[PDB]
Structure formats: C-alpha cells, structure tokens
Amino acid sequence: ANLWERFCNWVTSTDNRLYVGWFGVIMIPTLLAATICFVIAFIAAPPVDIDGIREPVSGSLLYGNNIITGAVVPSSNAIGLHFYPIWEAASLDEWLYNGGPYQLIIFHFLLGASCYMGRQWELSYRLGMRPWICVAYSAPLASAFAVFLIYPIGQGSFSDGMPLGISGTFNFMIVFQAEHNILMHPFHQLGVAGVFGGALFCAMHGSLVTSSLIRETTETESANYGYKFGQEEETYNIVAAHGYFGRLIFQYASFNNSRSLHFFLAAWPVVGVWFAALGISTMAFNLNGFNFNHSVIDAKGNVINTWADIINRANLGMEVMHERNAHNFPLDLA
Amino acid sequence: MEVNQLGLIATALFVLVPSVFLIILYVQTESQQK
C-alpha cells in the first residue's frame, strides 16, 4: 500500500507493545512535553510570583525544597486567565518569574490525559471489547480538570489552580475550605463516600475472592501458582464466597452474580468521584457548602453554637491568614 | 539547607539493604534449574 495507508496501519496496530492510535498521536507529544517540563521545573525552576504581588514562592529542589515542600507553582495572579506561552514573555527569565511552566504543564497534561481517555476507548474497539473502561477513567480525569482548569476559570485566575506539588496540594485544600466550606458540601461528602466506600469494597472483594480460592497448591507454594494465565475455569468458588457474605450480613445483601458485583465495584467509586469533581467544579462558581453559622438561637436570641460554628472558627483562621499580603479591601470575593 | 547529616546515610541504606535482599533472592531463583 501507499505510505499513508501503511502509517495508519502502524498507528492503529493491535500489535504494538504500547498501543499508539489516533488519540495517541496527540497524547504522546503532549504528555512528553508536560512530563519533561514538569521534571526540569520541579528540580531547577526559580521562585514564582504566584499571587502577583512580587512575593516569589520557591517550588524547586535546587532552590531549597524537598520532595514534600516542592512544587511547580501556579502562574501569577497578574496574568489571571490570560494565555501565557513561552513566546508571550520577553525572556525565559520573565517566563520563569511569572510561572509560565505551570501553564505549559497543565495545558499539555489536560490535553494528553483527555487523549489517554480517548485512547482507552480506541483500543477497546480494536480488541473487540466493550467500551466503557474510558467512562470509569472520566472520573479521575474530571477531577483533574476541576482543580487545574474549572476552578481557575470560575475564580478568574490560574494562580488559584492546584499547585503541582505535595504541600501545594494541601495549601489548595485548606484555602478551599476557608473559601467554600467544602467539608459541608454534599458533593464532597458523596466523594468521601465514593473513596472510603471504594476502599472498603476493594478490600471486601479482594478478601472474599481470596477467601474462596480453590485448593490447587501445596503449603510450600504460593496459592497464586494455583491460577494459570488464560485458564478457562474460574479460580475461586463464588457460591462459597456468597455463602459466607450472605451469612455475614443477610442473604439478599450479598451478590451471587459476578457481573452485578463487578458493575457495583465500578459504579460506586466512579459515581462518588464524579460528584467529588462536580463539587469542586460548582464551588468554582461559588455555590458553597451548607452554612449553619448561628443557626441555633435561644429564647432571648443568644446564639447557641453548634459544631458548625466551631468549623466556622477554624475556617476564619484559614481565611484571615491565607495570602497575608494580597488583600487590600475587606472582602475576599475571588 | 541545614539538613540532618545522617539523612544521607539513612536514605542510602534504607534503599540499598532491602533492594539488595530482593536482588539476591531474584537472581538465585533465575539460576535454579530451568
């Protein structure tokens, strides 16, 4: 065939050790660009004026950070949502001061990860598989979009995007609590149910299957040798597992259908994490957690504090201290 | 940065001692009769 035809055949080959594909044609270069820029910035970038007040924050290892404190720091509040590619800067030195690497990394990463999701659909189709693994990955992907793109858009600045760093992440969490009372938001509560329940059902499933593995090995060998890649026979007794779990709770609380069981395993965390993502993405537009501050009042009108008011006091501590030189007027409105 | 001077050796051995334990066990497994 012609060059193009052979190229297409190669790009879409089910035979490549790593699947390429058309999504991969975009994913590969964008992920490589984000990864390389990230690694170099995390090691060597100079301090970045995240809040646009000429107060540069040091993110990199060579400038006095460790793995836990280091970050690629968000772009300057002076930039806002303006697009700041390298060629918009007068010099690499200016680009670095203003947090150019952050934009480069996150835009390439978001594009690349969205293509990772497409690529998962793509390969499933090449392999004659059902197509929805890519829908499960939409949950973490939605969450990355929420913290690196939707939230900054709502608030008018990439300087309020999540920093690319471990301590930076906690900074974002704490400020987010002061500003949105996220803990009191039901979508974040559903996210907690999603991740705690995902952990729970992960352990539950692991333990129930492990508990009913069919004896195929001796006491000297790992039982894992009792399963051979590609064998036709199921390797555990689901009727035994259901027999156990139906008795632990009650019969109709347990699955005896593996397909229903595995659907539940997919659905519970994916749905909870979609609500986590939508929590961040709607607090992006300042629809915030429940506010019961001073909700309980006695017969005279004295305020009777509840645990909500004690939350409020912790939130106030975060609010009054955060970005301590950046506010000149009494309300923090974004 | 004024780091703990024992950080380096603690980190080095933390990696090396169990990594070498594993490597010893892997290699002698491979050398067992095919």
Binding site: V39, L61, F229 | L8
Partner: peptide, 30 residues
C-alpha cells in the same frame, strides 16, 4: 546532597518503569 538524593531515587524509579514494562516476565497462555 539532598537534591542529588531525591533526583537519584526518582531516576531509579523511571529506570524501574522501563524494565518493568519492556523486560517484564512475558505473560504466557495456560
């Protein structure tokens, strides 16, 4: 010395990724 240590561990992990993918124990059917 700390920067060196952190980057050294990181580099070992990326190398490990490479061997774990391209020099894995190949899966064999049955």
């Amino acid at each position: 010395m700390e920067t060196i240590t952190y980057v050294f561990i990181f580099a070992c992990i990326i190398a490990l990724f490479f061997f774990a993918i391209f020099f894995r124990e190949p899966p064999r059917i049955t």
